[PDB]
Write an enzyme that holds these catalytic residues in place. Structure first.
Site, short mmCIF file in Angstrom:
data_model
loop_
_atom_site.label_atom_id
_atom_site.label_comp_id
_atom_site.label_asym_id
_atom_site.label_seq_id
_atom_site.Cartn_x
_atom_site.Cartn_y
_atom_site.Cartn_z
CG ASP A 57 -0.25 -0.29 2.48
OD1 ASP A 57 0.97 -0.59 2.49
OD2 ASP A 57 -0.94 -0.22 3.51
CD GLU A 67 -4.04 -3.35 -1.37
OE1 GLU A 67 -4.11 -4.58 -1.27
OE2 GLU A 67 -3.26 -2.65 -0.69
CE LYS A 69 -4.38 -6.54 -4.36
NZ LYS A 69 -3.68 -7.63 -3.62
#
Lengths: 156, 153
Positions: A57, A67, A69
């Site tokens: 994060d 967050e 990804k």
DNA sequence: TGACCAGCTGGTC
DNA sequence: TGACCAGCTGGT
């Protein structure tokens, strides 16, 4: 030893320098958790990963948490989430926008930002399933790259 | 955005070349699952990975490959949900443990199934005594690996 | 796809 | 030392 070890030895000094740049930016391990890819997102976006962070994060210059990804589209088309998804995990990042980075292997291709409102469809989907099947953890449900590209805002 | 991006671009060709070398040796991502470090272990030991970080030698013997950065932690990770099904697979093969200080490889040890049974028995017994609850990543101490295994690098 | 199958790890008491 | 608390994903 394998003959290609010499090529590795030739490349190592540069690999070292890359790990040093990663460290300079709060990433202490480029070979795990997409560490070497995360560094690309950080330098392009201006985002930072703080010491003592929960996982992958980051925060912007205004203190807002995100967050992050990553996905290797040369291999799959669904973003991983959590190996044991349940309402408690969803709560961890329900309130923050997410930064999705698309890579062909290890090289960055695009980055998208999705706000909580853009992810509610998946939080609700997972909640709905959990509530119906006896509160069972969902094993790494995926968020389609297509969904991310359609609902998110491209930032790279 | 960040000024350091130019440094990254300067270093990139070489990083891509390293990823290409890993690909040539069956590793799809040097930045996940210790990919970049597993390549080093494969190139030093001569082991190869077939199309987990499991590998095989020239005789066909399969191995479980583990890696650890001793500057950060003292125990090797095993499985997030250790139970008899995982232990059953484990008992079948020897394990190759790589020790690192940062990204500087320091040593590699090999442990035979007989040398890890102490832990398989411990983990098995606990799984039952806990009411069939998976163990969350029990660790194998680096100390144990060095005292019971054979140094191969 | 929905939903189930997998693995590679670090941290701290 | 052992026991527990966490993370990042690809594959079908």
């Amino acid at each position: 030893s394998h003959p290609d070890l010499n090529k590795l030895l030739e490349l190592w000094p540069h690999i070292q320098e890359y790990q040093d740049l990663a460290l300079k930016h709060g990433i202490n391990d480029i070979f795990q958790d997409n560490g070497g890819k995360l560094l690309q997102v950080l330098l392009i976006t201006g985002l930072t990963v703080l010491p003592g962070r929960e996982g992958n994060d980051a925060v912007d210059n205004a203190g807002q948490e995100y967050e992050l990804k990553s996905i290797n589209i040369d291999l799959t088309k669904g973003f991983s989430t959590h190996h044991h998804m349940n309402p408690v995990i969803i709560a961890k990042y329900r309130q923050v926008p997410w930064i999705f980075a698309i890579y062909r292997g290890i090289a960055i291709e695009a980055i998208y930002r999705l706000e909580p409102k853009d992810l509610e469809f998946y939080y609700d989907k997972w909640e709905r399933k959990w509530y119906s099947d006896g509160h069972k953890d969902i094993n790494n449900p995926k968020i389609p790259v297509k969904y991310v590209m359609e609902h998110g805002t491209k930032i790279y």
